[PDB]
Amino acid sequence: RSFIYEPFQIPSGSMMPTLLIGDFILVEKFAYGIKDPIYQKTLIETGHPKRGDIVVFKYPEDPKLDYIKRAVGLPGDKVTYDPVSKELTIQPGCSSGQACENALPVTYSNVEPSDFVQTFSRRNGGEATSGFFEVPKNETKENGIRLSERKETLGDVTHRILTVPIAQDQVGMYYQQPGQQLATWIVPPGQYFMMGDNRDNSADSRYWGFVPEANLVGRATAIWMSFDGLRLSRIGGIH
Ligand SMILES: *C(=N)CNC(=O)[C@@H]1Cc2ccc(OCCN)c(c2)-c2cc(ccc2OCCN)[C@H](N(C)C(=O)[C@H](CCN)NC(=O)c2cnc(-c3ccc(C(C)(C)C)cc3)nc2C)C(=O)N[C@@H](C)C(=O)N1
């Protein structure tokens, strides 16, 4: 088993608080080679993402670019997102579109304030981000809103998500899958529904649709370095 590992820079905030601007991750590629006993042939197996894995993939709207999101929907999944509660419902194997009762348990913790504040640049009567500031919970920041935090359990994978208390998704700017209602998608075979942990600051599958299996690059396994000063506390596993 010969696994290829590649380094990626995280320049965006779409995966906060799990991945921050300045994190340098390691990605394990899904395609790996296995040679014959001595020398005869070489088999190349392609691993599949598990629900909740942090996956790097070639952007469907521009395959020259790599994007990183969490694979929340797998083939056959009926993915439903409530833009108001900012919570997901996953019903696996419901590709036919029937009244199935084998729903995946997606549970959420109590909401609490995060270690991050988001500031907005006044563009002559508007609000567009300039960056995400790490501010002590008892302290505050000018023109900045303190983001919320809660844990999300995708069946057997628990991770953290960030939410902006004032912002809510514009469901009219969402990708609408033909035949399905708004904020409801059934993942077709060989496709993946990707979402960012910074739920209100992530251009993901809600907006540009499913990711084909051929577009997948690999799984994020570690943070091997992080700059802001060095964030030595962040080197290690990705939780
Ligand atoms: C959702 N919306 C979240 N967004 C993403 O997922 C982004 C989307 C995106 C869009 C555009 C864009 O750049 C446009 C500029 N033309 C980026 C991301 C982007 C992506 C990256 C870096 C910058 C960047 O934009 C900057 C402009 N603001 C990274 N990226 C390109 C890499 O990580 C590359 C990959 C090469 N295919 N890796 C490296 O450049 C790299 C090379 N070598 C090393 C390295 C490390 C150590 C060593 C030693 C052995 C120690 C010596 C040697 C060599 N390290 C690195 C990191 C990117 O593609 N990231 C994706 C996941 C991303 O963030 N997309």
Swiss-Prot record:
It is a multi-pass membrane protein. It comes from the Bacteria. The active site is at S14, K69. Changing S14A: Loss of activity. It catalyses: Cleavage of hydrophobic, N-terminal signal or leader sequences from secreted and periplasmic proteins. Its main location: membrane. Its EC number is 3.4.21.89. GO terms for molecular function: endopeptidase activity; peptidase activity; serine-type endopeptidase activity. It is found in: Cell inner membrane. The chain holds residues 78 to 324 of 324 of the full protein. Keywords: Cell inner membrane, Cell membrane, Disulfide bond, Hydrolase, Membrane, Protease, Transmembrane, Transmembrane helix. Residues 1-239 are periplasmic. GO terms for cellular component: plasma membrane. The keyword Transferase does not apply. Disulfide bonds join C94-C100. Belongs to the peptidase S26 family. This is Signal peptidase I. One of its GO terms (biological process) is proteolysis.
